[PDB]
Structure 1
Amino acid sequence: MVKVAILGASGGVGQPLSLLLKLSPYVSELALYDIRAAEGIGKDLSHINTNSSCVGYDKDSIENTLSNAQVVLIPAGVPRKPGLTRDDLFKMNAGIVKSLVTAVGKFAPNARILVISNPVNSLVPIAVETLKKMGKFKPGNVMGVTNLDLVRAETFLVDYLMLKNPKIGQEQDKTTMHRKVTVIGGHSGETIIPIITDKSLVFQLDKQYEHFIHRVQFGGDEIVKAKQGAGSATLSMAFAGAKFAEEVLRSFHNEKPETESLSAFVYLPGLKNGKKAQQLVGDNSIEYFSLPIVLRNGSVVSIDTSVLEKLSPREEQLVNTAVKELRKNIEKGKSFILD
């Protein structure tokens, strides 16, 4: 009995995201919004025989969309095309995020905002600074959705074990690999830090360990390449988004998350153990990081810093490389709002 709003519901990620949300038993009302086509998508989903009402809204009805929404998912954004650089992509997506998050601050300021659009590293700071200007920022209620990195880590860990030690590989369940790997950091390239917490599995991977790390880090490129440079992960991104959203929704329902060490990109200074986590990643002013979180009533109430205590030596070096680049991605987002 959570009301969920999806902003950007007609897009490549948004459609399958809206479908997976419609299937959740934790949702009572699903409201879909987009500048185009959301009413028809809503109507199509409304035929599905699960116990949630689903309505889509036209471009002028964002207030009806958001009214009393407890959770707001934002996969809105512009897709890559000829003549649009990564910096154009950034600037248009930053304008979209600014505008959507402003609307949340106006029409549903108590909502948990789950930012799915990319680049997360910069767009989450944009969301936070947009809300601070408005006096509507609650640190536990803004989460960058980084879960696709964990999902990839769980899948590739098993793929590399199959390839390397078939007997150990055959023993693994891709759906429970979160017990053995945790992914922290940012959401792009070398900001992504996969931490295998079971050292026997690091042993079993042998010389595939670095290939594994590279593959989780550059997973998105593998799809962009598989799609001839024309698109990126849509379906797996919608999957990872809905899986994270479900963990958030379970917390309204007094249920423990199914994912061990579930991570999200969050505002460290405003959250319990955030200071400790800044100390552990070796940068005392770094404002954002994806780390394990504890949810209560849909809100992040503290950061679990366990994983950072027990880091291997090589993991320490990944963390340092990530932090360097993440500081600049954070500042690029901050300066979009602060100028």
Structure 2
Amino acid sequence: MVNVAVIGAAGGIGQSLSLLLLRELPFGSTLSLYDVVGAPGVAADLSHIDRAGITVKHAAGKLPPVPRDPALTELAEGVDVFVIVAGVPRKPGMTRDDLFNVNAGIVMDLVLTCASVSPNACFCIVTNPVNSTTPIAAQTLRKIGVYNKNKLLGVSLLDGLRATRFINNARHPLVVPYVPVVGGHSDVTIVPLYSQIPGPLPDESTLKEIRKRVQVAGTEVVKAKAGRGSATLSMAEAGARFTMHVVKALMGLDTPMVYAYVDTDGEHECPFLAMPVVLGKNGIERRLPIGPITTVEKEMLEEAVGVVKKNIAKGETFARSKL
């Protein structure tokens, strides 16, 4: 029925992400686990859970890393959704440029190897920075001639998790299930649109602080972790729920409206944007307009788009330099 592959399944994010998918994947699904170390152990661990009708496959790549790993090529056969989660997490000790360089090459190799075997699969990019790794994946897809603009999804959902949580904490018992977050998935590019959710809002004073908190929430966790790591459990929650939305859409079990960092297909001047889409059996089914926003929200989006464009260009420049 559906075969979902977690590429990078043995890291801190991948393990919890894989656990969530194992518990929620519909009966008859297959969970495929790839990592360059620790994949057999994660698979054995998860295979012991009493899911009925779930098959757990795995493959171990060569350490130290080999490009176009033959083991990944085998695993990628028949996969419908690739969750690209491999690469380094945003932990202290690597700049936002260092993270980009090693992770860009990792995303390139993995997407290249996976799409060469399963070119009609969906690709959910959670490897950071998704503002740049998503266009890098697109360029990789373009290079081998299998790019489908409706099957590449940069996972921006964690922003929505935080934006929803923070506003719900502010006006409890008034609770909403989601908050639109558009633009990008980096501090300067994250734009929550609280004006679009029902109910009275806090003063604009408090609102400014909550918006800022959404944008620097990743740093908030690194600080709370005394610099010993970054968000992994909430990261896994966002990656799984979004993968689930894609899976249910592929199966015709839902046509969900989600916010993701996607190819804009000419609907916005920016080539890629965190924006509302509805998913169907072919991936992105409809690109929706962002909707009415406040002047202050428009100002945030204008500055966000400015650096999103530079994020994209950086990723595309790296990609063409390596082909």
Scaled by the length of structure 2, the TM-score of the pair is 0.92
Please, which moves more after superposition, 312-321 or 78-87?
Answer: 78-87
Residue equivalent to 2:296: 314
Residue equivalent to 1:109: 119
2:170 aligned residue (147, 157, 160): 160
What is the number of equivalent residue pairs in this alignment?
310
Deviations 1:212-270 (A, max 9, x none): 11111111110011011221110100000101011111112323356xx411111112x
Q: Give the secondary-structure state (helix, strand or coil) at the position aligned to 1:249.
A: helix
Residue equivalent to 1:187: 185
Residues 248 and 298 in structure 1, CA contact (< 8 A), matched pair in contact too: no
Residue equivalent to 1:19: 19
Q: Structure 1: which amino acid aligns with 2:174?
A: E
Q: Give the secondary-structure state (helix, strand or coil) at the position aligned to 1:33.
A: strand
| Alpha-carbon distance change, 47 to 7 in structure 1, aligned in 2, over 3 angstroms | same
Residue equivalent to 1:330: 312
2:100 aligned residue (48, 73, 90): 90
Q: Give the secondary-structure state (helix, strand or coil) at the position aligned to 1:213.
A: helix
Equivalent-residue separation in structure 2 for 1:142 and 1:327 (angstroms) = 18
| Alpha-carbon distance change, 78 to 52 in structure 1, aligned in 2, over 3 angstroms | same
| Alpha-carbon distance change, 8 to 304 in structure 1, aligned in 2, over 3 angstroms | same
Q: Give the secondary-structure state (helix, strand or coil) at the position aligned to 1:31.
A: strand
Unaligned segments of structure 2, at least 5 residues: 62-69
Residues 224 and 231 in structure 1, CA contact (< 8 A), matched pair in contact too: yes
Shift in Å at residue 80 of structure 1?
4.9
Equivalent-residue separation in structure 1 for 2:141 and 2:208 (angstroms) = 39
Residue equivalent to 1:33: 34
Residue equivalent to 2:228: 230
Q: Which has the larger helix fraction?
A: 1
1:265 aligned residue (261, 266, 273): 261
Query: Over aligned residue pairs, what C-alpha RMSD do you find?
Result: 1.6
Equivalent-residue separation in structure 1 for 2:302 and 2:275 (angstroms) = 15
| Alpha-carbon distance change, 226 to 83 in structure 1, aligned in 2, over 3 angstroms | closer
Deviations 1:122-147 (A, max 9, x none): 00010000110110101011100000
Deviations 1:68-118 (A, max 9, x none): 000000110113567533212110000100000001221111110000110
Shift in Å at residue 21 of structure 1?
0.8
Residues 104 and 133 in structure 2, CA contact (< 8 A), matched pair in contact too: yes
| Alpha-carbon distance change, 236 to 109 in structure 1, aligned in 2, over 3 angstroms | same
Residues 92 and 229 in structure 2, CA contact (< 8 A), matched pair in contact too: no
Residues 120 and 187 in structure 1, CA contact (< 8 A), matched pair in contact too: yes
% identical aligned pairs: 38
2:288 counterpart of 1:290 = no
Runs (4+) of structure 1 exceeding 4 A deviation are: 80-83
Shift in Å at residue 17 of structure 1?
0.5
Unaligned segments of structure 1, at least 5 residues: 162-168, 270-274, 279-283
Equivalent-residue separation in structure 1 for 2:250 and 2:215 (angstroms) = 32
1:7-156 superposed matches below 5 A: 7-26=7-26, 28-50=29-51, 51-59=53-61, 60-80=70-90, 84-156=94-166
Shift in Å at residue 316 of structure 1?
0.7
